[PDB]
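User: Hello! My lab partner asked me to get a predicted holo structure for this protein. The small molecule is NAP, SMILES included with the sequence. Please write out the structure tokens.
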Amino acid sequence: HHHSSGLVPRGSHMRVGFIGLGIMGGPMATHLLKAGFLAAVYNRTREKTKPFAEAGVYVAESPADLAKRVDVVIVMVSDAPDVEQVLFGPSGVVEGARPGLIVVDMSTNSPDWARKFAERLAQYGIEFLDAPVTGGQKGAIEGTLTIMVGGKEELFHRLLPIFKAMGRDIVYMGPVGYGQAMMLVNQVVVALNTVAMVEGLKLAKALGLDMDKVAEVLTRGAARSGAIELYLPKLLKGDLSPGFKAEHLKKDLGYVLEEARKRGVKLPGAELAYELYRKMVEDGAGSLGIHALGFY
Ligand SMILES: NC(=O)c1ccc[n+]([C@@H]2O[C@H](COP(=O)([O-])OP(=O)(O)OC[C@H]3O[C@@H](n4cnc5c(N)ncnc54)[C@H](OP(=O)(O)O)[C@@H]3O)[C@@H](O)[C@H]2O)c1
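Assistant: Hello! Below are the structure tokens for the protein in complex with NAP.
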């Protein structure tokens, strides 16, 4: 069936549907709405679609109902199995998309998963990019995300206006899976920079140092990091909320270690970080921010 007009003209070929209105997806979709690209949203939990319905965005009943109404589907759900459900489940994107739709997975998973999604979607004549992001919840809210993209270079270029609504530095990394590969590199660094912060704070509190001065010194050379700038003021206030959930970093480190074993590289720091965050999930703190490691 054909459908009535929505917020974004059909002739633009740039109607976006957004799936996953979480800590990152809510602000990212709001940015696409401010820029005039957002036509529709889907969220598993309906209440989070409310603020978008109040601004006239269509709230779909399923990923398939969303895909039939848009040119570009952006997915920002938790993990690879979640992406599988929203693309390939009974009422997934592939059950409503027309050939020529583009799926952009902006969640974090792995190069292998990106290539699998692309291969499966190409059976339906659906295009795919992996475009994971860094900059945290603050970057999402401010629209300043760094977005790292794998797929057809032509499609990177066609979607650049959509990526610039959500982010600032938009980097084309290479073929499918190269955005996830860059993200796995990024998440090695983020995890170990976060363990750096939490161990420095544990030592500073054991030494009885003035936290005002500890924050002053650390917020500078070359101890200073993104993880300190984004999270040390929440940590010092005892605000353990995400931020970035510990269960999601555990997931990212699992993919890092799988890729390192495939390639014959030993990453003992990433292995330790995985163990630490695995324990944090087993202890029941998987939904706290990664900065609560050591303090939960
Ligand atoms: N937070 C950060 O700092 C950050 C930074 C960069 C990248 N990331 C990556 O971005 C992705 C999203 O992270 P987030 O922080 O936004 O997580 P989040 O706040 O936990 O939100 C996850 C979202 O995914 C939806 N979802 C999860 N499983 C699903 C399923 N099977 N079917 C349908 N929807 C499902 C959730 O729906 P409900 O609302 O129903 O729960 C929610 O909208 C993750 O891959 C994460 O690693 C996060």
